[PDB]
Amino acid sequence: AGPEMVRGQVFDVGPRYTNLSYIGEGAYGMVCSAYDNVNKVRVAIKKISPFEHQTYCQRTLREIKILLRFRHENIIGINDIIRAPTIEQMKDVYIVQDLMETDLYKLLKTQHLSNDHICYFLYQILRGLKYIHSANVLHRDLKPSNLLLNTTCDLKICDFGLARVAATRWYRAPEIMLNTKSIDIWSVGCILAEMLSNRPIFPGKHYLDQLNHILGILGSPSQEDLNCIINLKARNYLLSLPHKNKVPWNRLFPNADSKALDLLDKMLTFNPHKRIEVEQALAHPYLEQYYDPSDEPIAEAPFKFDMELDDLPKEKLKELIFEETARFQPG
Ligand SMILES: Cc1cnc(-c2ccccc2)nc1-c1c[nH]c(C(=O)N[C@H](CO)c2ccccc2)c1
Numbered sequence: 001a002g003p004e005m006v007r008g009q010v011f012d013v014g015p016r017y018t019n020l021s022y023i024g025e026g027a028y029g030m031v032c033s034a035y036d037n038v039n040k041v042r043v044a045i046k047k048i049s050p051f052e053h054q055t056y057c058q059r060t061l062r063e064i065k066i067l068l069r070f071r072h073e074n075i076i077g078i079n080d081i082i083r084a085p086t087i088e089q090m091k092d093v094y095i096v097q098d099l100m101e102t103d104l105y106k107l108l109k110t111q112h113l114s115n116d117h118i119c120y121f122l123y124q125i126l127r128g129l130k131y132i133h134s135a136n137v138l139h140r141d142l143k144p145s146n147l148l149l150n151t152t153c154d155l156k157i158c159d160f161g162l163a164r165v166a167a168t169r170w171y172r173a174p175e176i177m178l179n180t181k182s183i184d185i186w187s188v189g190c191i192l193a194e195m196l197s198n199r200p201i202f203p204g205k206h207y208l209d210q211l212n213h214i215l216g217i218l219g220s221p222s223q224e225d226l227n228c229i230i231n232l233k234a235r236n237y238l239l240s241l242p243h244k245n246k247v248p249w250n251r252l253f254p255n256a257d258s259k260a261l262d263l264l265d266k267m268l269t270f271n272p273h274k275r276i277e278v279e280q281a282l283a284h285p286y287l288e289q290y291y292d293p294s295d296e297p298i299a300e301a302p303f304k305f306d307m308e309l310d311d312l313p314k315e316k317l318k319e320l321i322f323e324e325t326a327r328f329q330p331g
Contacts, residue, residue: 001014006021009029011034027056028056029049031046041099048093054317058317061309063163074155078095078097104191126278136166138184143190185277217246259284
């Protein structure tokens, strides 16, 4: 048959994986649904072409290393990895994963969620995050498009490219734009708010406008909220702004559950030190119906990269990518 093509990208995944269809995109790749003739199921195939940039190579290696060690119901896994037999011919890497039904970005673009489903989705994000954080790892890019859903409404966290050992502007914590595990909680806060109204709570266009949108609902920050190593330009901008009143949560979300708004308030806290932790959020009365610490596992040990991935050249990272994927080759 030969190599399959989808929206301009060539996928050399045959003869095992055939009849490919478009399901997503990334900065240096494409996601496709394909038929696996061995397991007789449709699977997801993520093609990545990162070898022209050092940043894309480390983002690829970080994800592959994290997803292979992690084993959790609310985190996407790796079933198989395809690449050329030699390093000289390895221009692409194909990550084979479980095919999902939809993602939260698509679901919030077409459907209105009931409180029970908002509560069940939030629980699963935090259940998965509890495992990520227990491993001393930060996702750093939590957003509706990185939250995958199946037919039975089971959630799975994907895209561990930007993950680091303890991004999209709209779900970015204020402290990142001023100067930790709390940055993921802020993102979950933004996701919860988007589930309640089917729209982004803070749709900023640039870093200071993103802060302006946050201050537009939270109001002007206190002295303690600004007691950190702030960027001079950002500090001088915040001090030059007129007083902003705090928009109450029940006013912004009129028909939302009062318990959901209390947890939302604790997640969308300007000061990261006063922000609720993942285990504290799971214990909140809003998620009482699903809260079960006996069925909320943690990682066996903390995760650590033996090498300084940031300092390694593009060629050295390719060698490590080639070595990490060697286990999936026949022999
Ligand atoms: C593994 C998987 C399985 N099924 C589906 C899926 C199925 C049906 C409808 C929507 C998505 N998505 C995924 C999935 C979606 N995004 C990603 C995913 O890894 N996306 C990132 C960018 O966020 C990426 C990064 C670099 C190159 C390409 C892609 C995986």
